[PDB]
Amino acid sequence: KGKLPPVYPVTVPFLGHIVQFGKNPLEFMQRCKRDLKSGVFTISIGGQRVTIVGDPHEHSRFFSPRNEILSPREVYTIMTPVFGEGVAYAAPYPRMREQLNFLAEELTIAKFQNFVPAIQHEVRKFMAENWKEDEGVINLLEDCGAMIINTACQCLFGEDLRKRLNARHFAQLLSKMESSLIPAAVFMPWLLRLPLPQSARCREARAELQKILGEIIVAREKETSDLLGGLLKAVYRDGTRMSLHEVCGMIVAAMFAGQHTSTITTSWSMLHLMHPKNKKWLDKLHKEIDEFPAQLNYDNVMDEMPFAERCVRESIRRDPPLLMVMRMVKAEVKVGSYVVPKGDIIACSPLLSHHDEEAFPNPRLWDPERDEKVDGAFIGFGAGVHKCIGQKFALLQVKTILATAFREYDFQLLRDEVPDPDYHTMVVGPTLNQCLVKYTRKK
Amino acid sequence: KGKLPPVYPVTVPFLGHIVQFGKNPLEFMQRCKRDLKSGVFTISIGGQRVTIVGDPHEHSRFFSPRNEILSPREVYTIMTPVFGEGVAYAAPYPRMREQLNFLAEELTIAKFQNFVPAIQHEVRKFMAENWKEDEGVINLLEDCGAMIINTACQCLFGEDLRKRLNARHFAQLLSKMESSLIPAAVFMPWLLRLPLPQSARCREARAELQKILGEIIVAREKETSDLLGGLLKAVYRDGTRMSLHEVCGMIVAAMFAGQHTSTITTSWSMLHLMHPKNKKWLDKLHKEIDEFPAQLNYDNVMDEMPFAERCVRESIRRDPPLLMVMRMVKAEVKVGSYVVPKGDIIACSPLLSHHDEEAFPNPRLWDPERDEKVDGAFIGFGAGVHKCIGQKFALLQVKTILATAFREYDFQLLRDEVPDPDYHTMVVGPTLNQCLVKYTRKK
Amino acid sequence: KGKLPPVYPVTVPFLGHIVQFGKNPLEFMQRCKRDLKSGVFTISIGGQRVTIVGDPHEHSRFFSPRNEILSPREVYTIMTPVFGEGVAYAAPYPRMREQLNFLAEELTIAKFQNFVPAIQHEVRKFMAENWKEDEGVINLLEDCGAMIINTACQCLFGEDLRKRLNARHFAQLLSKMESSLIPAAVFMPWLLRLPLPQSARCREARAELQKILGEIIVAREKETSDLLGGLLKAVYRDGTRMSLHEVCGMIVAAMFAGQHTSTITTSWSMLHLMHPKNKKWLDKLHKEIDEFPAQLNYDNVMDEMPFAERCVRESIRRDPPLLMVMRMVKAEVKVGSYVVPKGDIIACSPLLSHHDEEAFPNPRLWDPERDEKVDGAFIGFGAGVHKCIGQKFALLQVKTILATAFREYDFQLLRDEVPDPDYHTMVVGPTLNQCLVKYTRKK
C-alpha cells in the first residue's frame, strides 16, 4: 500500500499509443520519461495499465523475480495457437520450466560439435547458387534470412528429417504462422477468448508437421542426436518423457525465435562493417579472420574471435531486434521508490536502455570498442532467469556467417547512410528496400 | 503443398494497414509489389492473411472459380443485417445463385422498355426544380446522387409504389443502413458473432419497408411489371416462389448497390468532360448527341452512342468506385507459380489493375480513346461468374443523364484541376467539397 | 417518420474518426458542418450513428428531455466498474435521480460554511512546502492538480477520515481508476459485455475504500457533517437510506468528476492572467482582491468577486475541459427541421458552440469582458436537468485559489504564447510540458 508510479493520463483513440510505438518508439518513451520526470512510469493501453521500468539501475527488479510473480504466460497468449496448448507458455508453471530447460540443454556450447562446418558448408552452397558472378546486386536482408534458416536446419536437423522437410518449406510454415498473429492483442486479452478462424488453420498446419516428425521417428526406430532426438530423450522430474506434441511445439518455437532476430543481427552487423566510415573496423575484422584457415571450427569462432563478438554485440546494442520485454505482475513488487500493483503489465525496454546516455555515451554512434557505463544496461538477450537460451547458438551462426562471407566478398551499400530501422514490425530490423547491396567476389 | 506467395511481415498497430489503404491505397499496394518483387502477395490484417492478385495476366485465376471454392459469403457478413437473413450472401449457395439470377433477369436490356423516357422525364423535372436560373452554383456530386435515386425509382417502381415510398425516403433508408456498417469488420469476423445494437435497428427499419411492399401487393391484387412484380413472379428450380422477405431484400440490395457507384461514375464523367483541356472530347460528345432528337430512346442511348460509352468507361478506368474485389478461399487454388491456401482471403484490385503501366500506358491520363494493352485488365464491373449484374442498367442511366444534361447546360468547374479522389469511404469517389460547379443554361 | 439529418458517409479505418477528434476536433466538426451544410448532422463511428447538434439556437432540444427519452446510462457504461453497480448511471432511472440529487444537496451554497478558510488554509500550506523560495520554477498544471485534490479533501472530509485516507492516496486511487478506462468503448458497447480483467481489479480497489469508510462510521458511532455523514443521513422517497456501497460510489464520482476539470480551469485561468498582453486584466483582478482582507470568506469569494468569475468563465469558454455532451436516444426527437431516430447517439459540443462566431465574435480571443451573442450558447457546465451539480463548488475552489495565489506571488510563463490544448485526453487541458512557470514571492 505504497506509492504508485506516475501515470500518463488516458488517451481517447483506441490503442492509439501503439501507432506511436510503431513510428518512433524511442521518442515516445523518452517523452513519457521527461514529462512525468520518472524513469519508472505507467501508460494505459486498451484499458491495460503498462508500467515501464525505464531506469537502467533498476534492471534487477525486473529480471530477478520468479514466474509465479512476474509471469510471461498472460502476455504471450498470442502464441498458443502456433506453439500449441500445453507447450511453453501455455503450460503449467513447473512443466513450463522443464520444457524451456530441455531446449536450453540442446543449445549448450557442449552440443555444437559439427555446427561450424555444417554452417560454413551451407553458406558456401548459398553463395555459389546466388552470388555466382564476379559482382552482383542483392537484398542483404532477404539473403541473410535464407542463410539463417538453411544453416539452422543443417545444425539442428538430421539428414532424414531435412529430406522430408526442407528449409524452404520450413521457412513457409514459420511465415504463415507469423502472419496469423495479432501482436496488439497483447492488450486485448478479451479478443483471445473468442474463436478466431486463423487459430484453427494454424493448428492444422502444425498437426501436418507433427505427422512428419512421427513418421520419421518410426523410421529411425526400424533402421537420435539431432534436436528432435535429443528432446525425445528428455525426462521430467516425475520420470516421464515429453509428448511428441510438446516436442513438435518446442522445435517450432526454436526456429520461430531465431528466424528474424538472427537474421536482423547479421544484416546490421554486415551493414555497419561495409560502411566507408567504418573501414577501420572492417580491417580489424579482416586481420582477425585472415589469422585462420579456411575450414573453421568451434574454438576459432567462439573462443578466438573477440572483435567479431564486439561488432555483433554493438549492432544489437544500437538496434535491438526486440524492443521490449514484458511480464504480467501476479503479485505486487517494489521498483525504486515505487510499487507496481498486481494486474499491471510490467515492461522493460532494450531500445530505451540501449539509448540512455549515462549508459551508452553517444548512443547513436555504432562503436564496437565501447563499453556500458552502467552495469547490466545491455539487455539485448535479457538477463536473469528468463535470459535468452538461444544466445550462444544465435551468436555462433552469426559469427560464422560474417567470417565466411567477408573472407570471400567485398560488399558495397547502395545508398549514402546506413538503413533506418523500421519500427512497424513485431521484430525490428532495417528497412527492407534500403538493404540493397553490391557484392564483389574477392581476388 | 507447393509454394506460398511472399508475405509482407506482420505489423503491430491494430488494423493499421487499413489506415494506409484509406490514405493512398495505390502507393500502398505498389510498395507491396515492389518490395517483395511479386504481383501475387500477402499481407496480414487483424490476423487475417489477405492475398492480393496484383498481376493483370492472372485475372482469370481469380474470376474463374465457382462459389463453392472462392466464396463471397464470408467476406460480406457485414451486409446480412441490412439485406436480411436467407438473402443473397446469407443464403445457401444454390438459393443464392437463383436469387442473384432473378434480379439479373429483371435488369436485362430486354426489360428496359420505358426506361430512357422515364429517366429523361426525371432529369428534366430535377433540372427545372434546382437549376431554375440562367446560371447558378451546385454540388455536382450531391445532385447526381439525387438524380440517380430519382431516375432509378421511376424505372423500377410503379406509380402505386412510389406514391407510398418516394425516392427521398428511400434515399434515407439507404443512408441510415450504410451508416450502420463496419467496413473494417471484413477483417473481424469475431465481431460479427457478437450482438450489435444497430444490427437490430436496421432489421426493424427493413421490416417497415416489407410491410409497405406487402400492403401494395394486396392492393394490386384487388384492382406486376415493375421490379417488385417481376420478382414475385419468379420460380426456383424446385417450383417455389421467393418469399416477400427475400424480395424485399433483393430490392434493397439493388438500390444500395447503385446509390454510390452510379452516382460517382456520372460525377467523374461530367467533371472530366467540363474540364478545359478536354474541350476536344466535349465537342466529340456534342456532335454525337446533337445527331439525335430531344425525346431519346433505348436504341439511341445503348446502340447509337459509342463515344459516351468510352467517356464513362474511361472514368471508371481512372477512378474505379470499388477499389477491391474479395473472396474467401474455401479450397486452395493455383495462381501463377504460387498456391493460395484455404482460409486466406483472396483479393483483386481494379484500382491496381487500372494503373498498371503495361496495361494502361500513362494511367494517370483520362483519355476516352485509349484501349487496354492487357486483355481483361479492365475490371470496373469485374468479370466471370460474379460480373456486375447491374452494369447495363448503371450504364443506361449514366449515359442518359449525360446526354440530357450536356444538351441543356454548360458546366464550369470552380477550381483549376479535377477533384482528388477521397479514399476514406467504402465507395470511392471525388472529394465532396471540391465538386463545386457553375451551370449555365444554354441558348 | 420525417426527415433524417444528413449523414457523413461511412469511412473504412476502424474508429478512425476518433483519431481526428483527438488531433483537431474543432476543424473536424467544422468540416462536417460546412460540407453537409447543416448545423445538425450525423457521423458513423464503429457502426454507431452519432448525431451532433451543432447549432447553438437548438440547444434546448438537446438539454430539455427527461432521462427516459435521452439517456446517459448507455453512453457511460465505461464508468460502471469504477463507480460500482447500482450507482449513478448503473442505477434504475428513479434511484439514479435521487442519488444524483442527494449529492447535489451536499454541494449547495448553503453547505459551504467553513470551506473558504479550509481552502485558504490548504493553499497556504502547499505554497509553503513547494514555493519556499523567493523565486522558483514549477509545473502549474501538476501543482493546481495537487491543490484541487488537497482543498477538496479539507472541505469534504472530516479529520478522522483524512487521517485514514490522505489526499495523496486518494489521488492515486483516482488515477489508477482513470487509467483502467477505455474511452473509445463508448462506441463499442459489445466490448463492455465481455469480461475485462481490469474491471475486477478496480472493484477490489473500491472495496478497499468501502472498508475504510465502514470502519470510520463505526468509530464515529462509538465516540456526520462531512460529505460522508451528509450522504448517510439521506432518505429516498420510499423511506430507506443509501447503502454504504452507494455512498462510497457517490464519493468516488464526486472526486473523480472534479480531479481534472477544476484543475484545468484553474491552470488556464492563471495562464491567461499571467500573460503580458493581459496585464490590464491582471490589474483589474488585483484591484478586486486588494479590496479584501487576508483571511477570506464565502461572501467575499462568491458574492463580492464578479471579475474573477468572468476570467474563470471565459477560460472555460475558450477551452471547455469537456468537449462533448452525449446521450442515447431512447425515443425519437425533433431537432430543427429534422428528426433523430431511436438508437442514435445524440451529442452536443461545448467546444463547437463556444467557437461559433455569431455566438462568440472572435472566439480565439480570451476576453473576460465579452458576452454571449446567442442565449444559452455557453454550455461549459451544460444546461437543464443534467446541468453540472458541482459547478458552485468547482467555482468556489477555483476562485479562492486564484485569489490566494495572485495575492502572494507573481507568475511568469516560460514561453512566448499560451499553451496549446492537448486534445488527446478524455478531459482536455493545456499541454503538460508547455505549462512551465516561474513564481516570484511578492513584497
Ligand SMILES: O=C(N[C@H](Cc1c[nH]c2ccccc12)C(=O)Nc1ccncc1)c1ccc(N2CCN(c3ccc(F)c(F)c3)CC2)cc1F
Ligand atoms: O516477436 C515476438 N514474439 C515472437 C514469438 C515469441 C513470443 N515469446 C516467445 C518466447 C520464446 C520464443 C518465441 C517467442 C519471438 O520470436 N520472440 C522472441 C522471443 C525470444 N527470443 C527470440 C524471439 C514479439 C515481438 C514484439 C511484440 N510486441 C510488439 C511491441 N509491443 C509493445 C509492448 C509494450 C509497449 F508498451 C508498447 F507500446 C508496445 C507488444 C510487444 C510481441 C511479440 F510477441
Ligand SMILES: O=C(N[C@H](Cc1c[nH]c2ccccc12)C(=O)Nc1ccncc1)c1ccc(N2CCN(c3ccc(F)c(F)c3)CC2)cc1F
Ligand atoms: O460498398 C461496399 N459494399 C456495398 C454493399 C455490398 C457488398 N456486397 C454486395 C453485393 C451486391 C450488392 C451490394 C453489395 C456495395 O454497394 N457494393 C457493391 C457491390 C457490387 N456492385 C455495386 C456495389 C463495400 C465497399 C468497400 C469495401 N471494402 C473497403 C476496402 N477493403 C479492403 C479490402 C482489401 C484490402 F486488402 C484492404 F486493405 C481494404 C475492404 C473492402 C467493402 C464493401 F462491402
Ligand SMILES: O=C(N[C@H](Cc1c[nH]c2ccccc12)C(=O)Nc1ccncc1)c1ccc(N2CCN(c3ccc(F)c(F)c3)CC2)cc1F
Ligand atoms: O471525463 C470523462 N468522464 C469522466 C467520468 C464520468 C462520466 N460521466 C460522469 C458523470 C458524473 C461524474 C463523472 C462522470 C468525468 O469526470 N466526467 C465529468 C462529467 C461531469 N462533470 C465533470 C466530469 C469523459 C471524457 C471524455 C469522453 N469522451 C471522449 C470524446 N468522445 C467523443 C464523443 C463524441 C464524438 F462524436 C467523438 F468523435 C468523440 C467520447 C466522449 C467521455 C468521458 F466519459
Ligand code: HEM
Ligand atoms: C539475436 C537473436 C536473439 C535475440 C536478440 C533474442 C533476444 C531475447 C530476449 C531479449 C529475451 C528475453 C529474455 C528475458 O526475459 O530475460 C529472449 C528470451 C528467449 N529467447 Fe531469445 N533472442 C534471440 C535468439 C533466440 C534463439 C535462436 C532462440 C532459440 C530457441 C531463442 C529463444 C529464446 C527463449 C526460449 C527465450 C526466453 C525463454 C524464457 O522465458 O526463459 N532466442 N531472447
Ligand code: HEM
Ligand atoms: C457503376 C456502377 C457499378 C459498378 C462500378 C459496379 C461494380 C461491380 C463490381 C466490381 C462487381 C464485382 C463483380 C465480380 O466479382 O466479378 C460487381 C458485382 C455486382 N454488382 Fe455491381 N457495380 C455497379 C452497379 C451495380 C448496380 C446498379 C447493381 C444493381 C443491382 C449492382 C449489383 C451488383 C451485383 C449483384 C454484383 C455481384 C453479384 C455476384 O456475386 O454475382 N451493381 N459490381
Ligand code: HEM
Ligand atoms: C470545472 C469543473 C467542471 C466542469 C467544467 C463540469 C462540466 C460538466 C458538464 C458539461 C456536465 C454535463 C451537464 C449536462 O448534461 O447538462 C456536467 C455534469 C455533471 N457534473 Fe460536472 N463539471 C465540473 C465539475 C464537477 C464537479 C466538481 C462535480 C462534482 C460532483 C461534477 C459533477 C457533475 C455531475 C454529477 C454531472 C451530471 C449529472 C447529471 O447527469 O445530472 N462536476 N459537468
